[PDB]
């Protein structure tokens, strides 16, 4: 009796009794997370002989009863799947597999070439991933533009129902900053529609009525959503990142053509040297066979399908590859809490110790010039929204990285926290710092320790190479930002002291 096993497995896994784990509970509410969710997925897989993807277990849409329902269904009973596309238990994937024939119904494909062209005036945007870190500012940038022209922004969010989904959205904007909140509520009242859904599912997990309406009403689609996780295998990422990208394309190839903005990552550059990676090349020509880093490959496969859709039907695409997306420069408490950078700043303040340098020292033991490659999200959202609006034709890809040869890297960040009075001690020798720093992290209260850089300490094993600028190419993005005159900078910004200082305050204020 499936539900009873689901429960008992959960109890075992999470250190509860079976009485504490009622069917209406969510895996997350018992202390579940991505790590334990993987363990759970394999355990249930082995017992029932069916796929139980991590994404089923962690959706805010799914209690344990839903996970059990899924097992039942799959046990008896149809969408694209890793085996239907790549071959069952394959160990390589290849670009020649990722063909639209295998993701979409033939009828949709037959009609797409002769579909009406994109609307010349964008009045209603559909956005995925709006409760995500980047997505929330993409939503807010579209709202600031469209609401004053009486336009609309429709958003898809995971949740049990529309009101639940709306509530998940609302609370990402409650971050200790009243100004942000007033701003969001005001714009949201006027121009936001929130629908519960799931892009890994049929018709994006919506009611047929709303899918048929969006297919008619929507002028432009921004696909910011994905399962963003650097440990899961490709096969757990396939559903969200690949089939997800394809269900979005289905909407974009129905009733009339709809430009897609697609968020991606530098991780797609698997076994190619930075210097050899074309920012605006054909992505299918870049390691066209790959072994099974599943994040990178899942995002790549997404790109490839969109490329196939442009080749088939002339769907306008813009791809934006973006990795270290730092804190908002204006709204307080707004920062991506789980990201490596946040964790690091958190960790330096908690321990109060930093190395002379995070980077290779020189010949004589001295600090060298280095650069940290990230962009604040306020600019990133503005840039993406602006260049995405303008992409009504063709296919173009953009590396949203910070390319400046400015000498602004982690050592300047530490100097700046010190200049602003935070008590951080500088330790001359790196390997000493490293073992002291691990000691000091282990001594931390459990709440802090989990937020800190302690899980990812492998990545501070060595001092980083002392490198200015970025080795990947960024001229398409840099030159477009320049031409479009985005921001006060009319260029990619430089990371400044005001921002680093803001991170320490945002961290105090969120109570880490």
From Swiss-Prot:
This is Carboxylic acid reductase. It comes from Segniliparus rugosus (strain ATCC BAA-974 / DSM 45345 / CCUG 50838 / CIP 108380 / JCM 13579 / CDC 945). It comes from the Bacteria. Catalyzes the ATP- and NADPH-dependent reduction of carboxylic acids to the corresponding aldehydes. Catalyzes the reduction of a very wide range of carboxylic acids, including benzoic acids, heterocyclic, phenylacetic, phenylpropanoic and fatty acid substrates. The chain holds residues 669 to 1187 of 1188 of the full protein. Residues 1-75 form the Carrier domain. The modification O-(pantetheine 4'-phosphoryl)serine is found at residue 34. Belongs to the ATP-dependent AMP-binding enzyme family. Carboxylic acid reductase subfamily. The N-terminal domain likely catalyzes substrate activation by formation of an initial acyl-AMP intermediate, the central region contains the phosphopantetheine attachment site, and the C-terminal domain catalyzes the reduction by NADPH of the intermediate thioester formed from the attack of the phosphopantetheine thiol at the carbonyl carbon of acyl-AMP. Large-scale domain motions occur between the adenylation and thiolation states. Phosphopantetheine binding alters the orientation of a key Asp, resulting in a productive orientation of the bound nicotinamide. Changing residue 343 to A: Loss of activity. NADP(+) binds at residues 131-134, 158, 168, 198-199, 224-226, 264, 295, 299, 322. Changing residue 323 to G: Does not affect benzoic acid reduction rates but leads to alcohol production. Displays modest benzaldehyde reductase activity. Changing residue 230 to P/N: Loss of activity.
